[PDB]
Every structure is written in structure tokens, then in C-alpha cells.
Design a protein around this motif. Structure first.
Motif, PDB file in Angstrom:
ATOM      1  N   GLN A  84      -9.161   5.274   9.822  1.00  0.00           N
ATOM      2  CA  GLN A  84      -7.913   4.700  10.314  1.00  0.00           C
ATOM      3  C   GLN A  84      -6.851   5.770  10.547  1.00  0.00           C
ATOM      4  N   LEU A  85      -6.762   6.763   9.659  1.00  0.00           N
ATOM      5  CA  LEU A  85      -5.844   7.876   9.897  1.00  0.00           C
ATOM      6  C   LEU A  85      -6.317   8.798  11.016  1.00  0.00           C
ATOM      7  N   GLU A  86      -7.628   8.870  11.274  1.00  0.00           N
ATOM      8  CA  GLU A  86      -8.106   9.525  12.491  1.00  0.00           C
ATOM      9  C   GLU A  86      -7.672   8.759  13.735  1.00  0.00           C
ATOM     10  N   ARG A  87      -7.692   7.426  13.672  1.00  0.00           N
ATOM     11  CA  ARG A  87      -7.203   6.570  14.746  1.00  0.00           C
ATOM     12  C   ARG A  87      -5.682   6.519  14.823  1.00  0.00           C
ATOM     13  N   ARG A  88      -4.987   7.081  13.825  1.00  0.00           N
ATOM     14  CA  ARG A  88      -3.526   7.219  13.772  1.00  0.00           C
ATOM     15  C   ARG A  88      -2.808   5.872  13.783  1.00  0.00           C
ATOM     16  N   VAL A  89      -3.324   4.912  13.021  1.00  0.00           N
ATOM     17  CA  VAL A  89      -2.570   3.713  12.675  1.00  0.00           C
ATOM     18  C   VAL A  89      -1.722   4.049  11.458  1.00  0.00           C
ATOM     19  N   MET A  90      -0.812   3.149  11.088  1.00  0.00           N
ATOM     20  CA  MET A  90       0.069   3.391   9.953  1.00  0.00           C
ATOM     21  C   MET A  90      -0.699   3.355   8.634  1.00  0.00           C
ATOM     22  N   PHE A  91      -0.572   4.451   7.878  1.00  0.00           N
ATOM     23  CA  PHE A  91      -1.289   4.629   6.619  1.00  0.00           C
ATOM     24  C   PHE A  91      -0.880   3.593   5.586  1.00  0.00           C
ATOM     25  N   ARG A  92       0.398   3.198   5.587  1.00  0.00           N
ATOM     26  CA  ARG A  92       0.878   2.177   4.667  1.00  0.00           C
ATOM     27  C   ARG A  92       0.180   0.851   4.917  1.00  0.00           C
ATOM     28  N   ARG A  93       0.036   0.474   6.192  1.00  0.00           N
ATOM     29  CA  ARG A  93      -0.730  -0.719   6.537  1.00  0.00           C
ATOM     30  C   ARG A  93      -2.199  -0.565   6.175  1.00  0.00           C
ATOM     31  N   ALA A  94      -2.745   0.653   6.271  1.00  0.00           N
ATOM     32  CA  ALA A  94      -4.138   0.871   5.871  1.00  0.00           C
ATOM     33  C   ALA A  94      -4.347   0.596   4.380  1.00  0.00           C
ATOM     34  N   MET A  95      -3.430   1.087   3.532  1.00  0.00           N
ATOM     35  CA  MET A  95      -3.522   0.785   2.100  1.00  0.00           C
ATOM     36  C   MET A  95      -3.297  -0.693   1.787  1.00  0.00           C
ATOM     37  N   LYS A  96      -2.346  -1.360   2.465  1.00  0.00           N
ATOM     38  CA  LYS A  96      -2.162  -2.794   2.215  1.00  0.00           C
ATOM     39  C   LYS A  96      -3.370  -3.620   2.648  1.00  0.00           C
ATOM     40  N   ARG A  97      -3.997  -3.279   3.782  1.00  0.00           N
ATOM     41  CA  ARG A  97      -5.213  -3.988   4.183  1.00  0.00           C
ATOM     42  C   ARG A  97      -6.355  -3.738   3.205  1.00  0.00           C
ATOM     43  N   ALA A  98      -6.479  -2.507   2.692  1.00  0.00           N
ATOM     44  CA  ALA A  98      -7.534  -2.204   1.727  1.00  0.00           C
ATOM     45  C   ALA A  98      -7.357  -2.987   0.426  1.00  0.00           C
ATOM     46  N   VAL A  99      -6.135  -2.994  -0.122  1.00  0.00           N
ATOM     47  CA  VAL A  99      -5.912  -3.693  -1.389  1.00  0.00           C
ATOM     48  C   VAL A  99      -5.994  -5.211  -1.198  1.00  0.00           C
ATOM     49  N   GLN A 100      -5.534  -5.728  -0.046  1.00  0.00           N
ATOM     50  CA  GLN A 100      -5.611  -7.156   0.235  1.00  0.00           C
ATOM     51  C   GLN A 100      -7.050  -7.622   0.387  1.00  0.00           C
ATOM     52  N   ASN A 101      -7.879  -6.845   1.091  1.00  0.00           N
ATOM     53  CA  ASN A 101      -9.259  -7.258   1.299  1.00  0.00           C
ATOM     54  C   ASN A 101     -10.078  -7.123   0.021  1.00  0.00           C
ATOM     55  N   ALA A 102      -9.767  -6.114  -0.810  1.00  0.00           N
ATOM     56  CA  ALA A 102     -10.427  -5.997  -2.109  1.00  0.00           C
ATOM     57  C   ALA A 102     -10.089  -7.172  -3.021  1.00  0.00           C
ATOM     58  N   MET A 103      -8.815  -7.591  -3.049  1.00  0.00           N
ATOM     59  CA  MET A 103      -8.460  -8.765  -3.844  1.00  0.00           C
ATOM     60  C   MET A 103      -9.045 -10.043  -3.260  1.00  0.00           C
ATOM     61  N   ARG A 104      -9.144 -10.124  -1.930  1.00  0.00           N
ATOM     62  CA  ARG A 104      -9.647 -11.333  -1.292  1.00  0.00           C
ATOM     63  C   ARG A 104     -11.129 -11.530  -1.572  1.00  0.00           C
ATOM     64  N   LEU A 105     -11.929 -10.471  -1.444  1.00  0.00           N
ATOM     65  CA  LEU A 105     -13.366 -10.601  -1.626  1.00  0.00           C
ATOM     66  C   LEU A 105     -13.886  -9.661  -2.715  1.00  0.00           C
ATOM     67  N   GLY A 106     -13.226  -9.622  -3.871  1.00  0.00           N
ATOM     68  CA  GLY A 106     -13.840  -8.971  -5.010  1.00  0.00           C
ATOM     69  C   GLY A 106     -13.064  -9.010  -6.310  1.00  0.00           C
TER      70      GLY A 106
END
Lengths: 98, 127, 59, 79, 206, 96
Positions: free
Chosen positions: E122-144
RNA sequence: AAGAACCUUACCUGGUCUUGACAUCCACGGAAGUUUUCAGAGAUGAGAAUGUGCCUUCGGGAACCGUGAGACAGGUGCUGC
RNA sequence: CCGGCCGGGAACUCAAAGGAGACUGCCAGUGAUAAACUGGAGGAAGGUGGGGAUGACGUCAAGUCAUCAUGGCCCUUACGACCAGGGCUACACACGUGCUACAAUGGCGCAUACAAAGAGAAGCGACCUCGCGAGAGCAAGCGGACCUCAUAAAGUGCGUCGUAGUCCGGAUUGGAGUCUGCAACUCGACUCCAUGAAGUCGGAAUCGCUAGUAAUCGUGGAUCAGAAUGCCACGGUGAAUAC
């Protein structure tokens, strides 16, 4: 009076391997000596934990090579024909002495 | 027929086998005076025997190994104390009052990184 | 016994040891021990076993 | 200080010495080897020893019997 | 900077070793060198396949390698031909006969290495890193499970004052030796520099 | 990346493997007294780069000559990194 | 720096090359290896003795070597503000 | 056959896995009826028994672009490479960390019983032989409870030196050499022989340590062709004092 000597990094793996060895020696019944507690050899290394400079900060590592020997003294024809393919463990080093 | 006591003094392990017999003792196939009776710390192996005060009542045979002279002497003394444990519990209470029952939990300390000795820090200047 | 001495590059067979009915090739010969090493492929691992000339018989 | 079972002579030094005693008297030539063992049989050479940025000539005399060629060439410069 | 590596301190009791074979010294060095060469080429070849772990077992004239993968179909390819082909070249580079093994990892966004690799991509694709961490923590809580911590360090918006941002909800007890915290790090290369992503996450109740 | 250094190292390993162990074990046997010569004037003609003392035990991850260990064949940093990654079997972190 | 005898050196004096000692795509011919000579301090410049494989649908299958320009390669060079 | 001899449960040290055990558990006093504090019995250790790993959010724009990777800049027919020599080991000085000693608690010759932790195949290498020596061969054993390193030393018994710059200490220097490595002058360690500086327990100032600790005495390992007074690590003897 042949002796089977076994080396491993994982003592649980080597104990399960020699337990299956003595279970295959004793699954019919024979005068078989159990595995001996031959001493574990410890390789200890102190290396530096920082890339540039250290004064008191070093990390310390240890390899424990656990060593067993079962010493099969009783000859059984089924045991000789099929004492292979019992443990199926890739981390166990096997040697034979006499 | 046999009364047995091990005893351990932080690098030394002994084995004490006693028959009821003559009071002369032997340690590693030679007597007490021939082994370390000329040396120091000789009275500690006599302390459990002289506290209760038997001399010629029993016959001792001790094999000791590891450590140094005083570690071996403490191991022999403590094997004598386990033999008296095997003897009786009133004398166990007397030896616990004296201070000979406890195995000494004082081992040598490991050498630590950044230090010359186990606890000795290297000297550093003010600047 | 005739041909009681073995050489490398010659197939040998195990008689008294626990490795009968398997293929083997001679790795090292100890002149002082008067006894020979066989490298057996077993458990996926090369394993040296030491045996005696009068104890084993070739195939 | 070295081994008494064998002296150390370079082969290129030996062929320079043999050619120089074949020729006779000769102007000094620049040699780069400082690891050498000399002998009273071959005392008489005017061979020169290299020490870094400057080259100095060495005229061997009768009293040196086992010394290095690099001892007479000073590698370091002091005031 | 002052933290211990938690996998390296959990290796004794909880985390299994990534290599479990045995060797003596004069082939121990060669086995570490061949293990690095096999792991490096396998990671380079299957970075598109987004693999989680590479576990090597050797019977000292054979190698058998187990790849924990999110998508086993990409690695096994078309009727086993592609996986047979990289098995062949792993055998050619190791000098020993090679066996291949595929272990599917469930919940790829709960797998620790794949979170770091996805944030790196995602940082290679240059999206916002803050959104990358929020999506990671949200998806981990959602399915694990209920604990994960992400640290993203280096050239965050090009600021002069250095600043490391880490996001926090759930529990990650690092000093506890019983709990199975999987931790992994990754590096993202961009035109302003390299960004380091470090993730800790536990998987299951004891 | 010291690829020049590593190429020099592997070249002298190859040259030492080519000019070692074919007559090197007979050097002391011919030179030593059995219980000057043409043989020893031939023996003092061997080259200098063929010796194993030319080699330096360098790392194989990086090529770094310092901090080497023979058992792992690696520098101290990469030994620590592989140990903490788990890539070295049996290298639990010692705690006595 | 858990190890500086030219060699592990990164620095200096002198001698050598600009596709390079190291990696990939080309045009020309061949394996390897072992005993040496003409000069050298060595890096390097040129001839002898010998074998000449599985061979793919005889494109001499496939590391390896000696020439040439761009792609490239290299840096233990600077910036830990 | 005095070398642990061989059938033996393997008694027992020991090794190495599964466990038990120690958790304020039990009782008194203190505390507010609470947490908790103190003492005692039992017990191998009693109050996170001892030690180690484990070092939170953050600070010092702390250190490393020289372990590696990477953004920008630079050389890219020279800030690149291959070599032979040298330097990184200099020397009117200054500082830091250690080693050896200044001595009788000790120095020299003889005898004497143990350790623990280790490593060893491009190796460990007992033993045969010669030498008042570092140490020179096809010497067995071992890829490791077997074989080697490996004689442990302080200590204990003596004989002597009798408080001296000395039978203290070894610096420095000169002869005759081993081992390593193609080659020890710059620039390795040693022993064979000879000399024996300073040093008479050290100013201002300053450092470590609360028990198996400080001191003191040996031993092993890493890198290592060969070269540690440093580093890691292990054991012997083992304090004094915390009102």
C-alpha cells in the motif's frame, strides 16, 4: 550388543523417537535396555547486539544437542526386519556402533 | 546393615555408608588424617559426631568427589547428617537446632557481560 | 573364506547387523580396526555403520 | 631469528645475483624485495632496497652475515 | 530500539523454529548458506503469490520445504507444473532432491507477515499510511482475535521532526512468555525513502 | 557492497583449491630430516597466493571479515537476525 | 577491531586497464588439466607436450575462456540535520 | 594381572526427560473487623529462596549511510579495479582501562589429593626416541561420559633466604633457537644463556563491592595459518562491615 545413538535439537522429539523405538522393541516382548541419559552438549555463543558499538550489551545463545543411546542387545527377527520407518522424524541424527 | 547419606556442598557430592562398628573412618580409600587432616576445615566432619558425642559407636565409609577441600568436607558432614536423618527424628530436631540439616544453597555466581567478575564492575572515571 | 576382503565399488551385504536386504556402498576402510564402514541410505539420511569382515557376508 | 634448517632467498633475487656476478661490476639496479638473506659468499653487491616513496642504495660489507636487506632501508621518516 | 525480538524470545516454548533440522558444524555452515539462498529465491519468486512462511526440513541429502501461503492455487499453478518447476530449480540450486509442500494459512489479514507485506504494498501504491493501519486493525478485529499493534516508521510525510506513529486498541502483552504473539517487519521503498512496518498480533486464547 | 572484496576472496579460494592438497602434505615430509639440495632449491619456488593463509574467513551474507563465526558462517549481526527470525535451528536465546 | 607480516587494508609511493575483478542480453572459435620458457617486484604480453565426454531432430547440447561501442557494472565516497 | 578386574538389582554420585515440592501454607501478636507487617513449628531453600533473560510511553536530531538496505548528490577513459613494497605498530608529550610487582602473608629446589566448564577432522593429537629447551617421523584413540588438550594452582609438609633495592620484581639489551605461515627488519608467541632501570605500597583527587560477594588462585572457549595482560565463561580458598 549393538548400540543405536541419537542426536537432536528437540528433546521432546528425541524422547518420542526413542519411546517409539523401545515400544517397537517391546511390542511383542524382549529383554531390551532403555535409552540412556548420555550428556547433552551445549554450544554457547556471546555476540554483540549493536552494529556499531557495545560496552555491556551482548546477546547470549545456546544450542543443546541432546544425546541418547538405546543399546539393543536382544536379537529379534521382526525387530531387525522392521525397525526402520518408525519415527519418521527429519530432525533426528542416527548412528550405529558396536 | 547399611546407613546411607549423600550430602552436597556446592560442587562436591559424597556418599556415606555406615555399619555399626569401630570408630575409625575412611574417606576415598584413605583415612581422614591422610586425606585432609593435616589441612584446614577438618573439624566440620567431626561436628555432627561430637555434637551427639559418639566416637567408637559406628563405622563410616565415605566416597567424596568434586569441588575443593572445604567443599568435600562440607559434603562429608552433610552426608553424616543425612545418615542421622535415617537414624532418628529427635536427633533431626537437635541437628536442626544446631544448624546442620540444611543443604547450603550458596553456589558460585555466573560471570556477567560488561563486568570483570560476577558482581565486580569495571572502574570508570568521572569524565 | 574366499573373497573375504571387500573393496570400494563392490556391492556388500549385511548378515548380522540390522541392515540386511538393503543396498550399500563402502565409504571408509579403517586398517587399524580391521573393520569396514557402510554408508546406508535410510530415513532419507546417509548413515555410516561399522561392521566386521567375518560378521557380514556379501551377496 | 629465522629457521636454521633453511635460509630464505627469493628466486628473482637469486637470478639477479647470478646475473650480476656473471657481469661483474655493475651500477645499482632497483630491487623491490626486502625479505632476503645474505651470505659471505655473495658479499659485494651494490643492490638497492626499496622503502616506499624513496629508493636508497645499499652497499653490503664483510660483517653482515645473516641480516635482511630491509634493515638498511629505513621505512619511516622522523624529524 | 530497546525491545527484544518477541519471536526470538518465544522460540523456546511457544514459537516453533523456522528450521527444525539437525546438522554438525562443517555442514551446519553450508546448510545455513543454502537455506538462505533457497529462502531468498523462493521469497523473490512468490512475492507475487504473497506467501507467509518458508519452513525447511532436511534429511542431509534431501530437502523438503513447506510454504505457508494465503493462496495455494497460485503457487501450485496449472496441474502442478509450475510448482514442479520451482521444485526442480530449488533442487538444482541446493544440489539435493527436493520435495515441495503447501500449507494454506487461514485469515490472511490475521497472518502477521501478510499484514506487513500488504502495508508495504500500500505504501508502494502511495495511499495514506494512516488509512492503511486503520484498515489493517479493523479487518483483524473483524475477522480474528482481539490484539494487534502496528508501527510505521520513517519519512511519514517528509517532516523534519522524526515521528513514529503506532495505533492501539486491544492487548499485546509482550513480556508474557505464554501468549502467542506473532511479529513481523517489512520495508517499503519509495522515492522519498524506505519505510519500516512492524506488526505484533496474537491469534488464539490459551 | 564490497563485491570487489568478495570476488578477491572467492578467486583466492579457487586458486588455493587448485594449487593446494596435491603436493602440500609432502612439503614437510621432503623438507624435514628423516630419522643445499636441488630438492629444497625446487621447494623454495612455490608462489604466494596459493597458501590458505591468504584466505580470510568472511561472511557469506555480507562479506564482512570481522565478527565471523565458523559454525554459522555468518557475521555477528546476521547471526543475531537469523536467530531472532528462527532461521537457525536450536539457537534458543541462552538465559542461565 | 571475537586478532594489522606486502595478503585480511579502508591509506600512501611506484607499475598497469577503461564494458572492467564481480551480474545479464550479443557477433567470432574452443573444453578442462598437468610439467615450462622469453622479461618482470608482481599485476601482466606471447609458444610447446596431453585428453577432446551424455551427445539433443549433425543449429559441436551446457559452466568456462580471448576481442568491441552503447545498455551496464563498481564505490568501506558525502549526507545518522 | 592390586590396573576399579565380571554375572549382578543396578543400591549410590552422576547424567536427562517426565513430575512432586514452597503457595504467607499453618499458628500466635500487630494492623480497624481489610490489605499487610513481625515472630515461630515443620521443611532443602519462607516471604518476587539465589541468579539470568525479559528494559513501557518517550528524551538525548545520542551511535552506525564503515554489517546490510535505501532517498538525494558525486566519480563513472578514476572518488573503480589489479598489483609490489610501506603505514594502520611512529614519538619531545597528555589522558583512560588493565597486567606485573614493590615482598617473609613472600622468593627458590623436592613431595603431595581432588575440581567445574569446555573444545577437537584443511583437527585434538597421549605415548616411542634425544635434549638441564622452545621442541623434530609412517605413534595409538576420537569425529566425542571412552581418546587428547589436562601435570590444576593457590594450599599442605620440609630445607633455605632473615627484612637488604635484597634467592623480591621482571623492564630493557646482547648472543644460540623452536612452532606457524611462500616469507617474523619495520611487524608474532616462547623457551636455552647472560645483564638486571625504575620500584621502599603512591599527592590533590577518584573507583568497585552487602555472600559464595569483594579479594585471591588456577582452567577453558570465540575470532585464530601463528600471535590475548582484552573479552566471554567455569571452578578452589573465601572475608570485614551495614548503628
Amino acid at each position: 550388543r549393538i548400540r543405536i545413538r541419537l542426536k537432536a535439537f528437540d528433546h521432546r522429539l528425541i524422547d518420542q523417537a526413542t519411546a517409539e523405538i523401545v515400544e517397537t522393541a517391546k511390542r511383542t516382548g524382549a529383554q531390551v535396555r532403555g535409552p540412556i541419559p548420555l550428556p547433552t552438549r551445549k554450544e554457547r555463543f556471546t555476540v554483540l547486539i549493536s552494529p556499531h558499538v557495545n560496552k555491556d550489551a551482548r546477546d547470549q545463545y545456546e544450542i543443546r544437542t541432546h544425546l541418547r543411546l538405546v543399546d539393543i542387545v536382544e536379537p529379534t527377527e521382526k525387530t531387525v526386519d522392521a525397525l526402520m520407518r518408525l519415527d519418521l522424524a527429519a530432525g533426528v541424527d542416527v548412528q550405529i556402533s558396536l | 546393615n547399611q546407613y546411607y547419606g549423600t550430602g552436597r556442598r556446592k560442587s562436591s557430592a559424597a556418599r556415606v555408608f555406615i555399619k555399626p562398628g569401630n570408630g575409625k573412618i575412611v574417606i576415598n580409600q584413605r583415612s581422614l588424617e591422610q586425606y585432609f587432616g593435616r589441612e584446614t576445615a577438618r573439624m566440620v566432619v567431626r561436628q555432627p559426631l561430637e555434637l551427639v558425642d559418639m566416637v567408637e559407636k559406628l563405622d563410616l565409609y565415605i566416597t567424596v568427589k568434586g569441588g575443593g577441600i572445604s567443599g568435600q568436607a562440607g559434603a562429608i558432614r552433610h552426608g553424616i547428617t543425612r545418615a542421622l536423618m535415617e537414624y532418628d527424628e529427635s536427633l533431626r530436631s537437635e541437628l536442626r537446632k544446631a544448624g546442620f540439616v540444611t543443604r547450603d544453597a550458596r553456589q558460585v555466581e555466573r560471570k556477567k557481560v560488561g563486568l570483570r567478575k560476577a558482581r565486580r564492575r569495571p572502574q570508570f572515571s568521572k569524565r | 573364506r574366499p573373497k573375504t576382503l571387500f573393496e570400494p565399488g563392490e556391492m556388500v551385504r549385511v548378515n548380522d547387523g540390522p541392515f540386511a536386504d538393503f543396498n550399500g556402498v563402502v565409504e571408509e576402510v579403517d586398517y587399524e580396526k580391521s573393520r569396514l564402514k557402510v554408508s546406508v541410505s535410510i530415513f532419507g539420511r546417509a548413515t555410516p555403520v561399522e561392521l566386521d569382515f567375518s560378521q557380514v557376508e556379501k551377496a | 631469528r629465522s629457521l636454521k634448517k633453511g635460509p630464505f632467498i627469493d628466486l628473482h633475487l637469486l637470478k639477479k645475483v647470478e646475473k650480476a656476478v656473471e657481469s661483474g661490476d655493475k651500477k645499482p639496479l632497483r630491487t623491490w624485495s626486502r625479505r632476503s638473506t645474505i651470505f659471505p659468499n655473495m658479499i659485494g653487491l651494490t643492490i638497492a632496497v626499496h622503502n616506499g616513496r624513496q629508493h636508497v642504495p645499499v652497499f653490503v660489507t664483510d660483517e653482515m652475515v645473516g641480516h635482511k636487506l630491509g634493515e638498511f632501508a629505513p621505512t619511516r621518516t622522523y624529524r | 530500539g530497546q525491545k527484544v525480538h518477541p519471536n526470538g524470545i518465544r522460540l523456546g516454548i511457544v514459537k516453533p523454529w523456522n528450521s527444525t533440522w539437525f546438522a554438525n558444524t562443517k555442514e551446519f555452515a553450508d546448510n545455513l548458506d543454502s537455506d538462505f539462498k533457497v529462502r531468498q529465491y523462493l521469497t523473490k519468486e512468490l512475492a507475487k503469490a504473497s506467501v507467509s512462511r518458508i519452513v525447511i526440513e532436511r534429511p542431509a541429502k534431501s530437502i523438503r520445504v513447506t510454504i505457508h501461503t494465503a493462496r495455494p492455487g497460485i503457487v501450485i499453478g496449472k496441474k502442478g507444473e509450475d510448482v514442479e518447476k520451482l521444485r526442480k530449480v530449488v533442487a538444482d540450486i541446493a544440489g539435493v532432491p527436493a520435495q515441495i509442500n503447501i500449507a494454506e494459512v487461514r485469515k490472511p489479514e490475521l497472518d502477521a507477515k501478510l499484514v506487513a507485506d500488504s502495508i508495504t504494498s500500500q505504501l508502494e501504491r502511495r495511499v495514506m499510511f494512516r488509512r492503511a493501519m486503520k484498515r489493517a486493525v479493523q479487518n483483524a478485529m473483524r475477522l480474528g482475535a482481539k490484539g494487534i499493534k502496528v508501527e510505521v516508521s520513517g519519512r511519514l510525510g517528509g517532516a523534519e521532526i522524526a515521528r513514529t506513529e503506532w495505533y492501539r486498541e486491544g492487548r499485546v502483552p509482550l513480556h508474557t512468555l505464554r501468549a502467542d504473539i506473532d511479529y513481523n517487519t517489512s520495508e517499503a521503498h519509495t522515492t522519498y525513502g524506505v519505510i519500516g512496518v512492524k506488526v505484533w498480533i496474537f491469534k488464539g486464547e490459551i | 557492497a564490497k563485491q570487489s572484496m568478495k570476488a578477491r576472496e572467492v578467486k583466492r579460494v579457487a586458486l588455493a583449491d587448485k594449487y593446494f592438497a596435491k603436493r602440500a602434505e609432502l612439503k614437510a615430509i621432503i623438507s624435514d630430516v628423516n630419522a643445499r639440495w636441488n630438492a629444497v632449491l625446487k621447494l623454495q619456488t612455490l608462489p604466494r597466493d596459493s597458501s590458505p593463509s591468504r584466505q580470510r574467513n568472511r561472511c557469506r551474507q555480507t562479506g564482512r571479515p570481522h565478527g565471523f563465526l565458523r559454525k554459522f558462517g555468518l557475521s555477528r549481526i546476521k547471526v543475531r537476525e537469523a536467530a531472532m527470525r528462527g532461521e537457525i535451528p536450536g539457537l534458543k536465546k541462552a538465559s542461565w
